[PDB]
Amino acid sequence: INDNRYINGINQFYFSIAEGRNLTLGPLLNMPSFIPTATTPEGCTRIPSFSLTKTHWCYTHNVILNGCSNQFVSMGIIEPTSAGFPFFRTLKTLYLSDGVNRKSCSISTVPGGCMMYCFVSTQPERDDYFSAAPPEQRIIIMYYNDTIVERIINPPGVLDVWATLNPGTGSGVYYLGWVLFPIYGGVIKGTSLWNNQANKYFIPQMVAALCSQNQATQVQNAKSSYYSSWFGNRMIQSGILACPLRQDLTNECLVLPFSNDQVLMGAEGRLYMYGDSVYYYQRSNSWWPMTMLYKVTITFTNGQPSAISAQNVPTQQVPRPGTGDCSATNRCPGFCLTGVYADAWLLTNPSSTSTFGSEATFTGSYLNTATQRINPTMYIANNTQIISSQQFGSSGQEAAYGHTTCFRDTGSVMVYCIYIIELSSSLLGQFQIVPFIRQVTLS
Amino acid sequence: INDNRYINGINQFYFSIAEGRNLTLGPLLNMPSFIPTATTPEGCTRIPSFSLTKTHWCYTHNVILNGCSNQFVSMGIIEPTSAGFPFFRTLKTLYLSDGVNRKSCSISTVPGGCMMYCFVSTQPERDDYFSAAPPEQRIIIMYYNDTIVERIINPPGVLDVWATLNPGTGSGVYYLGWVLFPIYGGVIKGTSLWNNQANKYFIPQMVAALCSQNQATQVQNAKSSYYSSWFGNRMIQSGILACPLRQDLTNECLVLPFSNDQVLMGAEGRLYMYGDSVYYYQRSNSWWPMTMLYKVTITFTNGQPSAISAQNVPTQQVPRPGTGDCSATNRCPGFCLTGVYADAWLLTNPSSTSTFGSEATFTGSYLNTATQRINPTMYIANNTQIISSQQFGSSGQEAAYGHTTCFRDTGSVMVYCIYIIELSSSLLGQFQIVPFIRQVTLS
Amino acid sequence: INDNRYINGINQFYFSIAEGRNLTLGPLLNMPSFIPTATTPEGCTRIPSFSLTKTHWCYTHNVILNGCSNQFVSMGIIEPTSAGFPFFRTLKTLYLSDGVNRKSCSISTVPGGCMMYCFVSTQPERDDYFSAAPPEQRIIIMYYNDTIVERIINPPGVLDVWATLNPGTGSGVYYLGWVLFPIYGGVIKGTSLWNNQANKYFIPQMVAALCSQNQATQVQNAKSSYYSSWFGNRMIQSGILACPLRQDLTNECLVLPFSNDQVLMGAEGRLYMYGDSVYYYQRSNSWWPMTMLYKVTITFTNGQPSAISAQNVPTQQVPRPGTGDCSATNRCPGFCLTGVYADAWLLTNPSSTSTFGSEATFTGSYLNTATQRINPTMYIANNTQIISSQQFGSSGQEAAYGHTTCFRDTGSVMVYCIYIIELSSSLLGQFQIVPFIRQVTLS
Amino acid sequence: INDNRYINGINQFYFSIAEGRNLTLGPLLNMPSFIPTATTPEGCTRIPSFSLTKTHWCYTHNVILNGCSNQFVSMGIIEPTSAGFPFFRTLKTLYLSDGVNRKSCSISTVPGGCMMYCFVSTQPERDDYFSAAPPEQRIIIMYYNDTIVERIINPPGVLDVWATLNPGTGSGVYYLGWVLFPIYGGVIKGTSLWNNQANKYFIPQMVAALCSQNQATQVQNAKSSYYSSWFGNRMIQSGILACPLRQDLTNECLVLPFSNDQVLMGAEGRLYMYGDSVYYYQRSNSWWPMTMLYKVTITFTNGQPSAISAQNVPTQQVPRPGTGDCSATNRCPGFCLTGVYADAWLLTNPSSTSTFGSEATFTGSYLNTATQRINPTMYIANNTQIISSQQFGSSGQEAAYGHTTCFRDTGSVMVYCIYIIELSSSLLGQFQIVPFIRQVTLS
Numbered sequence A, B, C, D: 001i002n003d004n005r006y007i008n009g010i011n012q013f014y015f016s017i018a019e020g021r022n023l024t025l026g027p028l029l030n031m032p033s034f035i036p037t038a039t040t041p042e043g044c045t046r047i048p049s050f051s052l053t054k055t056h057w058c059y060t061h062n063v064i065l066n067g068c069s070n071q072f073v074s075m076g077i078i079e080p081t082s083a084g085f086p087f088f089r090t091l092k093t094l095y096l097s098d099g100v101n102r103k104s105c106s107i108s109t110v111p112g113g114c115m116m117y118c119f120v121s122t123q124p125e126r127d128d129y130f131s132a133a134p135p136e137q138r139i140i141i142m143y144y145n146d147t148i149v150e151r152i153i154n155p156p157g158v159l160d161v162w163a164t165l166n167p168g169t170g171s172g173v174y175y176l177g178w179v180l181f182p183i184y185g186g187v188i189k190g191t192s193l194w195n196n197q198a199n200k201y202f203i204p205q206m207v208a209a210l211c212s213q214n215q216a217t218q219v220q221n222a223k224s225s226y227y228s229s230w231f232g233n234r235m236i237q238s239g240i241l242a243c244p245l246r247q248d249l250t251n252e253c254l255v256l257p258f259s260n261d262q263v264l265m266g267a268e269g270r271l272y273m274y275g276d277s278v279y280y281y282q283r284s285n286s287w288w289p290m291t292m293l294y295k296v297t298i299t300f301t302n303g304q305p306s307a308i309s310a311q312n313v314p315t316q317q318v319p320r321p322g323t324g325d326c327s328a329t330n331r332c333p334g335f336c337l338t339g340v341y342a343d344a345w346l347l348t349n350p351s352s353t354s355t356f357g358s359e360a361t362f363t364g365s366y367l368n369t370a371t372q373r374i375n376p377t378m379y380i381a382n383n384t385q386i387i388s389s390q391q392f393g394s395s396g397q398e399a400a401y402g403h404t405t406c407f408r409d410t411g412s413v414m415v416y417c418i419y420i421i422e423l424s425s426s427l428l429g430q431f432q433i434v435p436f437i438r439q440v441t442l443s
């Protein structure tokens, strides 16, 4: 279990609206990395997932022997060092290496262990969208007492509805007895979902002022952005997978898709917990290149999640490198299928302002360039501007995904955020996933 | 505990004299590294120590926050991956961060845990040699059941005899109920040790053929090489520290110095176990730049180690970068105080030939250059030549210490050696200690 | 169920056209044989059939007590050994010994067990062709829960149409709810089948360049090759038997003959599964002595197989020992009735080239001689040449049928092929059916 | 469970003294072999162990990949074929392949499964005798419900008493709640066992009439035959290992050595069950080259085996190939260390004659030659002559160990004996262990 200095500073909004205005990033602090490195120049470690909770943390990433498989799992606690800052102490390690190609895995903390959700890849991504059958889905529970239970799940409404289903790779969350995971995939034309989603679209609140197209043109393009001709003519859908914490899971997990009137085209994502509220981060793999965060309201019918609703925190801040007419400078609706995973952590409560998210502050990392996965930069920002930032390495430095997480030392009363970034390395391995850590200072 | 595939392939001579002649190194294999990385550009991780035994392994290294402290400890088991090669699974982690400057630590496996030996540094190395008082010594026992017992030891014959005492940083060994650690330091003039060591010297068997000085000149210079005017005019001594496995250690550990007629000037080192025989690796910090390995015979008087004797395995292979008239090309006796730690693992038994070590084969890493810590290269070699080698990275690549360890997969019947090398990194940290792993093929 | 290392490497094309060009056979590996041996010098074990699927494998062969009956059935899973290679673990054995002379049996894997198809022999083969009545047909289902259900089937269009009907002995396949088995026999003159097949013939694409007869002469001879005067003046027909997976089968199995415009004279054969496509191997018992493989397209009318279409993979590689003017050196059409069963496994997808099968790669075993069943040799070959081969035993070594099957270890990422060959033995039994296994290396 | 035709014909004396006189061997019958074959020319399958009981049978043998490791285990039942003779139906298979070198394994049937006893070899046999420490011992229980429990046992009175301990490789037996295994090894000079065994010797009853030395010379030589200077100067001891049927065995198994006044020098062996009496077969690895069988009387003190007593069945029949002055023609006491394992099954009760074993009849296989492991021959014999025999293969045919077992078909009322012989093969593998089966006819 985590040290008393952290058990009460996890999964919360740490600053008040007023304080958020005076927040800045401190120097990067040096701690022993809990994320394993490759031991060959061509080894590839990618797609990390990190979950932290009151009692402990869970970590995992994919390992491919030659170029960019096995799945490395880690788990432990946080404890203070004599310098005052954290040390992620690993208490158990696991390496799922057995021939099953588990990919796009999302991990979540659960009482006594970690629950991981992966899908079994057996062909190029695109082929998964064309094949009417969905890839195999698996949820592995790994207890700290070293028991391991892996199950091949078959949730209702997936077969013959989703041509593919993938976990979002971002952390899932343990909520009211269930483990929720972000998911996405392609839905088949003619299905109820497809029909119920028909004619729906979502346009971020700050698009109008920045887009040059008219309201009617924008609406038409936005509607079309949820369908991909390149990916088997499927409706790219974002959603949540809810599994009850059991060791005999089969078809009890439920697929809850987001309404396309509240969310953009399906993509990778992450689920958060700020107090009793669930939040969702949706990668911007469509036309809008800015950070997308939503407050998720979950409805339970008879002790079972029956529907989800998402409210976007309106921003125009922190763009992501895209390709073509969907670079970080795009502002107009249309169909796009490019981007990067770059989640953000809300240091301030969006519900604290009279108008939801009118003044929000978040932190994370992003690749500062319009079309290249280059110039990784850690930052703090509000809805319209970046109020603090520090690029890592010299310009041209290649990077990829970035998972950010913050917690507070209730002893010293300071917030530390960990920025897990995939860095292109020149010495060992294709990428080196680094758990950068620094403080978020008030002043 | 280690997997059944390794429990019977540890601490042994794996090949016969005949087989050693046809051994070559395989490609480097990619496994998740169990050695933690720095998270800042200037963070320094150095001085590793690794001990592997039938049941498990222990690992540790020093961490300094800005440039080249805290001590990271790790422990776990070995298990096969679906590719056939090993995966060092960490089962527990520890970070000794509390203000005590533990340095030059050596670690050893012990039943149920790890025993580490460090000294507390409070001033520049040189000052330790001038001060008549020796630094404080500590042995920490860390059990897998998470109990930790640290003791400040005071072995007899240290106070007022040794101006300084340091662990060799190389792994110690658990032998017949005792934990043995390599040690070295400076002895004060006028002491019994100094007197008993008076006029003693050691000249490697293959020096004559390579040295141009005459037998009388060589003898005179060799005698003088054990005294350093730069390090407080002390006799630089190599030796072994033997501690009985107890949780209340005070003054039961015994300091057993090597006779200077059998060993070169004191330096860092490592202890090994090949079956029932103990072996010692002595860093070449003096005039002779080649790998020094000795078969150690331990004498017990009344259940207590009373004396050690060392027999050198004669070689002229694998030089180490030195400074001035003590580069890798030096062959003549004199006083030197330069070099690097580069241990070697004996893949063949030296006692198997009629004349001890007439045909020996060893493997390890070495810096291929005469005076610079550059061009790290993993190799296999006999007494006079390198029969297999592969440099890592492009020329100019900086590196430092290298700790090598081999074991066998009794399932697939192949030997794997792990080459832990301190690599100068350009991205994260001053150095990146990497646990390179590859196979030693017969053919 | 099979180990996770194989569940996803079964019934697929393992290499790309480009990779197929650099494939070679590895050394034979030693595993415990799952095929039972005779215990007397004259005992005869012959005619094996092997089916492997995602979950498990099925095996069977005929046993005759004195010289060349009972039917041995076996079933199990595949699991890795500490050497990395497979071990076919038998989980159940059966010996059908009850007075019913079940011959020419083909076996196929089915969910939860094996389905075997045999015919009851009561007289010399030739007599079966002269008698207007067809031998009795039986399909036995053997569940892993040890239930056994044998049925005497009577499919429509057999009585008074086929003077005889035999399973091809090669494995059948479980496809979309039905079990398909290769069949062959003789059709009576004057029947619809005979009439619809009238004037049809098939000439392999690579015959012209190798045959010296002119297009008109070849066509005439090919037409006549489907009729045997020696076997009761019947049209020797090849085909597929499709049975729905039921325990009360009577007349629901359907006989689907191949068009004689797409296939050569009827003979033994085997059915395969490469992804969602069905393939057929037709023994060369007629004039063309080279390996015959066809991609089978199955048409369903009202949930029932209604017609099959076959597309040949054009080759001139891997000949088979024949008699007279039909040796391995024959290239001209005519009537022949000699050959051996020697199937081949496609390591490459024939549909991957713009022109179907323009560059195909297959592996298997063949008897390297023109007219004798001698010199068994395992090989890898493309359409025109053998790119890798290794003969077994010394020249003159007698052998017979060869059934080849390949799968992949998704853990180590290597393909293993099993070459089941009937070997003439000198010690125990007439033949020793051996399951040779080796790897197919890329490089 | 076995068929009703055999459940009541196992582990008994099948013939009366009078009937034994008219017994002859029938022709070898052909059944599917339940003993797996090697799949490479150099693969080595050796050292089989077979246990048959009322309910089922257990089988196992050692597998070495190149030349003469893993351990193959098999288990099943016996059922009649339509020819009337048996068919050993395998119901489960296991392959212990994990890097642990389990050798000299003995197997025994136990309720619900098989219990196997092996020792872990890590060095040449001879070295085990010189090292004061005994090899590691293991007993593996394998249940038909597929549970497997392996334990590293440490019975009292082994450490520092036996320099080595090996199972006899012959089948053990389940007796009154305990599993008994034959064992042998070398005892250290100066131990209680050594002292209690001092001056003891055993001379077979029929030696005098055949030996030319006098009673005093014979006694002196016999005493010395229990000590081997070649095997570390140890007393070669034969004995029984008794383990209570538990899944948590540690030190409950008991080592019960035979008195050297009743048994010859230690060697491999087998334990039998004839009704309620236990019998022991001791390989003739010493001076006397004839078959050694003893009726074992076991004493229990407080529900625990406390002592064993052996009564020899006096014979001079069925010699075994030995080396030097210990060939099959030797009859004089002295020290020898050569021979072969060739057990025998008692078809007649030795206690049925007024004088124990005055007229005994046994069957088995033996190598008919004086010093070579050649000419395997199955036979039936009384104390002084071979009344029936049939050699296998042509002269010169190499073979090795032979394990014989008989049971009765209470339905047809005939006895079948299975002769498991290691045959040197020319086609596949070094040896082919064959389960020959034939009937023992009365008339």
Ligand SMILES: *[C@@H]1O[C@H](CO)[C@@H](O[C@@H]2O[C@H](CO)[C@@H](O)[C@H](O)[C@H]2NC(C)=O)[C@H](O)[C@H]1NC(C)=O
Pocket: A112, A143, A145, A146, A147, A247
């Ligand atoms: C490790 O912890 C888990 C979690 O408590 C244990 O899981 C229990 O497993 C049994 C069946 O094996 C279930 O009936 C219990 O309900 C589970 N507990 C719950 C509610 O989580 C697991 O057994 C533990 N490992 C052991 C046996 O030491």
Ligand SMILES: *[C@@H]1O[C@H](CO)[C@@H](O[C@@H]2O[C@H](CO)[C@@H](O)[C@H](O)[C@H]2NC(C)=O)[C@H](O)[C@H]1NC(C)=O
Pocket: A358, A359, A360, A382, A383, A384, A385, A387
């Ligand atoms: C995000 O932060 C920026 C920078 O702090 C805010 O911009 C400032 O707005 C105040 C008005 O409240 C002006 O006095 C400053 O001059 C602005 N800074 C400059 C020079 O850019 C911005 O308003 C914030 N966005 C919100 C309201 O959340």
Ligand SMILES: *[C@@H]1O[C@H](CO)[C@@H](O[C@@H]2O[C@H](CO)[C@@H](O)[C@H](O)[C@H]2NC(C)=O)[C@H](O)[C@H]1NC(C)=O
Pocket: B112, B143, B145, B146, B147, B247
């Ligand atoms: C963790 O393991 C160690 C090693 O067994 C335990 O150490 C024992 O400690 C007590 C005093 O606390 C000694 O008297 C024993 O002799 C020690 N055992 C020996 C011989 O090593 C330690 O107690 C264990 N931790 C716990 C209490 O769970």
Ligand SMILES: *[C@@H]1O[C@H](CO)[C@@H](O[C@@H]2O[C@H](CO)[C@@H](O)[C@H](O)[C@H]2NC(C)=O)[C@H](O)[C@H]1NC(C)=O
Pocket: B358, B359, B360, B382, B383, B384, B385, B387
């Ligand atoms: C160390 O290895 C080298 C290289 O294998 C040995 O040198 C070879 O010695 C043999 C004689 O035994 C010669 O036939 C070769 O020509 C030598 N190799 C070459 C060309 O350098 C060397 O002898 C070995 N050192 C020993 C004896 O341990």
Ligand SMILES: *[C@@H]1O[C@H](CO)[C@@H](O[C@@H]2O[C@H](CO)[C@@H](O)[C@H](O)[C@H]2NC(C)=O)[C@H](O)[C@H]1NC(C)=O
Pocket: C112, C143, C145, C146, C147, C247
């Ligand atoms: C062994 O498995 C088979 C396959 O499931 C069982 O077969 C069932 O048999 C009943 C009639 O006996 C049918 O009505 C079911 O439809 C069959 N199941 C199907 C659909 O395959 C068989 O009963 C099992 N053996 C037992 C009874 O344990």
Ligand SMILES: *[C@@H]1O[C@H](CO)[C@@H](O[C@@H]2O[C@H](CO)[C@@H](O)[C@H](O)[C@H]2NC(C)=O)[C@H](O)[C@H]1NC(C)=O
Pocket: C358, C359, C360, C382, C383, C384, C385, C387
């Ligand atoms: C089958 O394999 C053979 C051997 O690899 C191919 O023949 C080679 O063809 C290339 C041209 O692509 C030539 O450069 C080589 O010289 C040929 N090898 C020799 C010397 O025989 C053959 O073309 C392959 N058949 C196909 C096209 O599938």
Ligand SMILES: *[C@@H]1O[C@H](CO)[C@@H](O[C@@H]2O[C@H](CO)[C@@H](O)[C@H](O)[C@H]2NC(C)=O)[C@H](O)[C@H]1NC(C)=O
Pocket: D358, D359, D360, D382, D383, D384, D385, D387
């Ligand atoms: C073992 O069997 C042999 C052969 O049957 C016995 O020898 C026979 O003994 C009888 C006397 O009872 C003579 O009439 C025969 O002539 C002997 N057979 C020959 C010609 O060798 C022998 O006695 C048996 N051994 C015993 C007594 O167990």
Ligand SMILES: *[C@H]1O[C@H](CO)[C@@H](O)[C@H](O)[C@H]1NC(C)=O
Pocket: A018, A019, A021, A022, A443
């Ligand atoms: C942050 O700093 C500003 C400027 O120094 C100060 O006016 C403001 O009150 C601070 N915010 C709070 C309330 O912490």
Ligand SMILES: *[C@H]1O[C@H](CO)[C@@H](O)[C@H](O)[C@H]1NC(C)=O
Pocket: B018, B019, B021, B022, B443
């Ligand atoms: C090693 O290889 C050489 C050359 O192929 C061979 O002659 C030698 O016997 C091998 N060494 C051994 C005995 O393994």
Ligand SMILES: *[C@H]1O[C@H](CO)[C@@H](O)[C@H](O)[C@H]1NC(C)=O
Pocket: C018, C019, C021, C022, C443
């Ligand atoms: C196979 O080997 C050849 C020759 O080394 C190489 O050129 C070719 O690229 C390889 N094929 C592939 C793409 O795997």
Ligand SMILES: *[C@H]1O[C@H](CO)[C@@H](O)[C@H](O)[C@H]1NC(C)=O
Pocket: D018, D019, D021, D022, D443
């Ligand atoms: C065995 O055969 C002999 C000779 O035919 C006969 O005299 C004897 O009674 C038989 N033994 C018995 C009693 O079965």
Ligand SMILES: [Ca+2]
Pocket: A127, A128, A129, A130, A131, A132, A133, A134, A135, A162, A163, A164
């Ligand atoms: Ca799909």
Ligand SMILES: [Ca+2]
Pocket: B127, B128, B129, B130, B131, B132, B133, B134, B135, B162, B163, B164
């Ligand atoms: Ca000092």
Ligand SMILES: [Ca+2]
Pocket: C127, C128, C129, C130, C131, C132, C133, C134, C135, C162, C163, C164
């Ligand atoms: Ca007929």
Ligand SMILES: [Ca+2]
Pocket: D127, D128, D129, D130, D131, D132, D133, D134, D135, D162, D163, D164
């Ligand atoms: Ca020993």
